[PDB]
């Protein structure tokens, strides 16, 4: 049967996307920029959580340091502005999930409960309820108003490197180090379906905006998953690229993946076609292992990628508006077939 | 003798544990009401 599928693949054509170039670089923090998150209501400013613990807010247009925020103690591993209500959630290895209010620039409510240094926060899009999960191997669910944990989605057998809150029945996509991913009947307190198509730490996951799917990463492979049924959608061509740290998808089906190699990958989300590799640069003084993109996100526009690299740099990427199907095409896509996943 | 951390205290057990019903300091209701955006 393989030959049929392969033939079908060759028949189809992954569309051309404009490639990328390093538009802006910001040596802002004094640590790794492990978290980056961008305001989805206005597309004006984006904040980034350092290892220093001082999450700093950055205007896009200028690029300048809008303002620092330092309520945490340990590395702010993740943050998440809620477009729904003006609350910047964040989270550190100090186990706090502090909710800032940007109408005041202070912190408002802490969410105590988490046993171990929480790695990720995701706010629920259609509720006043937020999801968080860390080394505890538990994806908790906080009612914001009342600042209690409502429910605790036990299941995972190992730390839980990412999480994504969606509006549907599978309200949580929990991506763990346990070489799994879970979709949850949140109301039930049960994994509705559990995809496991990963050899290694599933340590970079992203919801697609207008598709209702979620890409996940392993050490190399980068599946993309359709979370209605709880079904696979598409294997990718990430066969030689590094350990994926972050995996932010664009509005226009332009799935990003960030390498521990340092190499910025770039995929057509629909197909899997690796339509640009880009070996990143480090700052003059750095060491060659340090060039590692540890964070990433796209704007509302989708025309600016922001990347929290370990060179203490917040690099930003434009799509080339001078590009065509002849002036910089993709990397001449070819499904390899060598006992492959495609 | 005294050993590094490897497999964290997983909140599976803490979930199956019985409630305490104590009243901690910070769980006292602070900022009851939420804010919202224009939209």
């Amino acid at each position: 049967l393989i030959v049929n599928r392969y033939e079908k693949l060759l028949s189809q054509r992954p569309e051309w996307h404009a490639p990328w170039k390093l538009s802006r670089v910001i040596n802002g923090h004094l640590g790794w920029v492990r978290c980056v998150a961008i305001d989805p209501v206005d597309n004006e400013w984006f904040i980034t959580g350092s290892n220093d613990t001082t999450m700093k807010v950055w205007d896009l247009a200028t690029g300048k340091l809008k303002t620092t925020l330092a309520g945490h103690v340990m590395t702010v591993r993740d943050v998440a502005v809620s477009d729904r209500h003006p609350y910047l959630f964040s989270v550190s290895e100090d186990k706090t999930v502090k909710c800032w209010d940007l109408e005041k620039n202070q912190i408002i409510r802490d969410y105590y409960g988490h046993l171990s240094g929480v790695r990720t926060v995701s706010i629920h899009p259609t509720l006043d309820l937020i999801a968080t999960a860390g080394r505890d191997s538990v994806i908790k669910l906080w009612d914001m108003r009342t600042r209690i944990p409502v429910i605790t989605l036990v299941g995972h057998k190992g730390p839980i490197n990412q999480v994504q809150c969606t509006p549907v029945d599978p309200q949580v996509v929990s991506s763990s180090t346990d070489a799994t991913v879970r979709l949850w009947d949140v109301v039930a307190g049960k994994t509705m379906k559990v995809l496991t198509h990963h050899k290694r730490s599933v340590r970079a996951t992203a919801l697609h905006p207008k598709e209702f799917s979620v890409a996940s990463a392993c050490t190399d492979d980068i599946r993309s998953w359709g979370l209605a049924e709880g079904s696979l959608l598409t294997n990718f061509e990430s066969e030689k690229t590094g350990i994926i740290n972050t995996l932010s998808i664009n509005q226009d089906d332009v799935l990003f993946a960030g390498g521990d190699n340092g190499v910025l990958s770039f995929y057509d989300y629909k197909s899997g076609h690796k339509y640009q590799s880009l070996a990143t640069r480090e700052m003059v003084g750095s060491l060659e292992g340090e060039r590692s993109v540890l964070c990433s996100t796209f704007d509302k526009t989708g025309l600016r990628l922001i990347t929290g690299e370990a060179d203490k740099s917040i690099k930003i990427w434009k799509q080339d508006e001078t590009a065509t199907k002849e002036s910089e095409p993709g990397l001449a896509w070819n499904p390899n077939l060598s006992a492959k996943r495609f | 003798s005294h050993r590094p951390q490897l497999e964290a205290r997983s909140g599976a057990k803490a979930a199956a544990y019985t409630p305490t019903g104590i009243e901690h300091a910070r769980l006292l209701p602070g900022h009851t009401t939420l804010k919202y955006r224009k939209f």
Binding site: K21, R24, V25, N27, D42, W45, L65, T67, L102, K104 | -
Partner: peptide
């Protein structure tokens, strides 16, 4: 990189001095 179109910025201080909010309180007049 002093030559290239990559525009580097070694920022330090805040523009808005932790008073000017990041989002503004919408209201009646």
């Amino acid at each position: 990189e002093v030559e290239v179109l990559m525009e580097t910025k070694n920022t330090q201080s805040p523009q808005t001095p932790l008073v000017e909010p990041v989002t503004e309180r919408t209201k009646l007049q």
